[PDB]
Symmetry: C3
Subunit: 426 residues, 3 copies
């Protein structure tokens, strides 16, 4: 129910987070097959085959029968080690992006949480507006009944009333909308959520921008991923270099053989050579090769890896400019939130005193209760529009921390301190 | 001209629909080559080759003249069947997404069709606004001429007139833009389109939400595609399992070769063995093999397929909760459309009576005709903003029908029933 | 500083432009390896291997020792030439898109610049608004001090003041934002930028739209790229046709051999055949093959390439509809800009005369100076909202020129003519 608990149940409800985790699992597991080729290749084959050599040596008839194990083991080829390193760095990549997605979950969660509150706010306010305009219409109606005014005004207040009805329904509708938005990252409905403890609000001042810039230089996930991409490009480079490598290898195998000769040609002077055999063999030995020159195969690849490299570096710098922009913008947004909160506070005070004034106006009955509710309307609107400003302060409070690439459950707990009273959702 | 006919010509004018159709054609045709490998592989590779030995067995010249056909046919390998099933499911995928795109074309079609209707409205009424403000400029002008109100007001009205002119030009401009928007899907410019039969609106109540839930769950295209994706992942799993398959084979080949001999070394005791060859051959037989352990080849792939599976499943549930969200939101939007239509109707009646009232004001001339056209302004603005609301009702109709995964020409035919009088576009 | 210089320093600062450049370098360089296969394949693969017979073959140990260079050279396979042509066309593609981004850098570069100007504008004027409202607060305050009015008004003016303060901070904030936006393209902060020379502002009429269309047919980069895609699809088609090609080839290689015998079975009646032999060889000759029939390999591929072709064609027409839409829309936007500029000009004149009027009002003291500054507020707001309109005129100019697929530094120079006075940024 509390934002913390909301994070808790939602910690498993997210598929994409779990999806990404599983993807990381795919990467780390893929490292295994990345290690695989270096290991020896035990194998087996078998065959049977009749043959008939027509023409010249025509009339011979020869079935053939054989089977063999074939162990093989390459030794010298660093390219596989290279690919292994690629797999490693890619794994680190997947790790980082996974953490990123975690932070994303945090953000979305908090956002969706606040939206419900805001919807409740607008709901109630639009309601009070409804009643106010309603008795406005009733008054005006009665005023026509005694004939003081033109019918046109009656229809006017009519239109006001219908309009505000639409305003009710759309808002109430937005309520459940946001509710389902919450279920989207939960899979569960919630009857109620804790109200903000506005009385104990934190008007915390921002840290100086430069240190934040430093921490940003140190620990944004994205730029880190860029650097990993760069190093990976370097790995691609040496992998392109790998083509020049001599390929030391070692075969090892044994094989049975049968083959029973037949046909009239075998008859007469078989000379043992035409006789059926039972031979078997245990071949084992080195294998090796070297490309020397291959039409410029391993040449263009080099430059390709190079362009890939420098381009990746460009992406890195782009990320750099990006994080600078983002963090500054966030900081600034926080300040904006501050000032806005100030303004709306004062507005609250204003509408309040105005309200009390008009209430006194009804105290000796100078006005109508309707008007009192008009001031009441302005009052509430100002109220949780100010609350809205506070939540915006919170969101910015996360974004800057998000900008750092840091974030944790603990910040959300600090948020959880802010919550207070239970509040029914619908 | 009518929305139905517009859809009719639209059915061929769309490239992307036809594109997707042809893509389905590709997906189906590819199933054929998916069936292909099982078929026998006939072949030929005759060639000639000189040879000149040296060192130890130096000086014995020769030249082979090989020529042989090679039919081949493996029998046991389920992995290919697996890939066939994959291709099948892929074809189902392409099918589903194709139908989806059809619905998409429908939606966009009706949308663009309505936008024109709206722009016409805004155009006309804006024009009336132009005339009204104009004659205000004239009145105020003359009022300066007789020496009354200060020049500043004159320039004010001037600004009004110029501003509203700009509004005209941008209005007309948007009109032709929308016309082109229509041509974009149609490839045709249309001088005129049918007006809505506003007199006979359909105030249908929405069905209870749960039934719609059950239906859409039963037949949404997207989630269906997800399920196909999951099944495909399972197929990938058995395909990973396929690496344990022994590979039964059957070679079948034949042909002749003539290696003529030459060189001085052949001279002396040729022993028939050094005579020129003239042999042919008819080899045929099985070629079995089983991989045994191979460094963990067919291992990591298993878990990879597994993670692929579960992640796909997570996507499935994701899309599930998603469509729940969407359909509820749609229902809600429809209700909003209802209430809005109500409100604007009443606003229409109101502004109308206000109009008639002021007209009566001019009946003894208390006002100016411009004022009457101000009431007229608010009037028609209200009118076809209400029309706009009705179109929104239509769009929501198609949307709720869309989330079902249903949709067809028929609802659009009912929309065609909604249409009435011809109206020139520009 | 001037827009031209800004473009100049920026012209190298862009990563993505340089990125695309290097990518073009890749596309070109890859043509080399595309040419590569036709070249001769020199090679080598020496190796050594022990052998030990058993069962009938038992007791005759040996160890083969082989070494051989291996040149190879294919003669006839058009598919390689085909793929070469593919690579060529791909190079053309990367070229074109590179040109696209070359325009893209320009557009944004103007955009942010004008945004900076605008931000400066709104900033200053908001400041003036601040001072005005401030003195209203002071007036109302003092008025309460002598007690002419209710406290509620005091709080009202209070609220106005805090609000406008918030507007200041967000304004300044937006200023620095835009500054950083500029740095994003440049990597450099800028103290100052040239003011527009509004006095000599251009108002050229657009060329008639049809001529612009014929011009459009010439060289939009996008559509050209589409046509290249089509031709590429055709190349894919002939490449599918290339599976019918007989594969004429030429083997050419030489190698030595040693192979030493061992074992007691070799002893006795060796018959020369059971003796060590240091043979060498110089094999050379033709190679050839032809598929005949392969289970429908090169069949489904044909239809596949065909579908690829037609789909590409559909994309081409899609691009056609696209460019028509965009160019007309641009033209229209220009017209809108014109009329808007007209309107705001007149508004400026109006507010000006109103200002002078009220100034005269203070000349004999009929009003507060604050009010005069209110007119001042409306004044400047109108002023550089009009400026904003002029920049929109410029942006539209660049847009329509962009739709042409044209654009150059020279148009930006023509823009550079428009600039005038130096202006500090913050």
């Amino acid at each position: 129910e509390n934002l913390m608990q909301v994070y808790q149940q939602a910690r498993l409800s997210n598929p994409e987070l779990r999806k990404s985790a599983a993807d990381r699992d795919a990467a780390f597991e893929k490292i295994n097959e990345a290690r695989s080729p270096l290991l020896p290749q035990l194998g087996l084959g078998a065959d049977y085959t009749y043959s008939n050599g027509y023409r010249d040596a025509n009339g011979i008839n020869s079935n053939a029968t054989s089977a063999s194990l074939q162990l093989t083991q390459s030794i010298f080829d660093m390219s596989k080690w290279r690919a292994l390193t690629l797999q490693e760095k890619a794994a680190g990549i997947q790790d980082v992006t996974y953490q990123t997605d975690q932070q994303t979950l945090i953000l979305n969660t908090a956002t969706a949480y606040f939206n419900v509150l805001n919807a409740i706010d607008v709901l109630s306010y639009t309601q009070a507006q409804k009643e106010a305009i309603y008795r406005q219409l009733d008054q005006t109606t009665q005023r026509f009944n005694v004939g003081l005014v033109a019918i046109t005004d009656v229809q006017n207040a009519r239109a006001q009333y219908d309009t505000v009805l639409a305003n009710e329904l759309t808002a109430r509708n937005n309520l459940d909308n946001a509710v389902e938005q919450l279920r989207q990252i939960t899979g569960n409905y919630y009857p109620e959520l804790a109200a903000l403890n506005v009385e104990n609000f934190k008007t915390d001042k921002p840290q100086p921008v430069n240190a934040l810039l430093k921490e940003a230089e140190k620990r944004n996930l994205s730029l880190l991923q860029a650097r990993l991409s760069q190093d990976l490009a370097r790995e691609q480079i040496r992998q392109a270099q790998d083509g020049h490598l001599p390929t030391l290898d070692l075969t090892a195998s044994t094989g049975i053989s049968d083959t029973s000769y037949s046909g009239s040609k075998t008859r007469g002077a078989a000379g043992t050579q035409y006789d059926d055999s039972n031979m078997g063999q245990n071949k084992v030995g080195l294998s090796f090769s070297l490309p020397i020159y291959q039409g410029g195969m391993v040449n263009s690849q080099v430059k390709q890896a190079q362009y890939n490299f420098v381009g990746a570096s460009e992406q890195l710098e782009s990320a750099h400019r990006s994080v600078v922009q983002t963090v500054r913008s966030s900081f600034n947004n926080i300040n904006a939130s501050i000032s806005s909160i100030n303004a709306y506070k004062q507005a609250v005070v204003s509408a309040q005193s105005s309200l009390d004034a008009m209430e006194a106006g009804y105290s000796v009955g100078t006005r109508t209760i309707v008007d009192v509710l008009d001031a009441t309307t302005t009052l509430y609107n100002a109220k949780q529009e100010l609350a809205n400003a506070r939540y915006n302060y919170l969101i910015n409070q996360l974004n800057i921390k998000s900008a750092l690439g840091t974030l944790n459950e603990q910040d959300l707990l600090a948020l959880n301190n802010a919550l207070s009273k239970p509040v029914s959702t619908n």
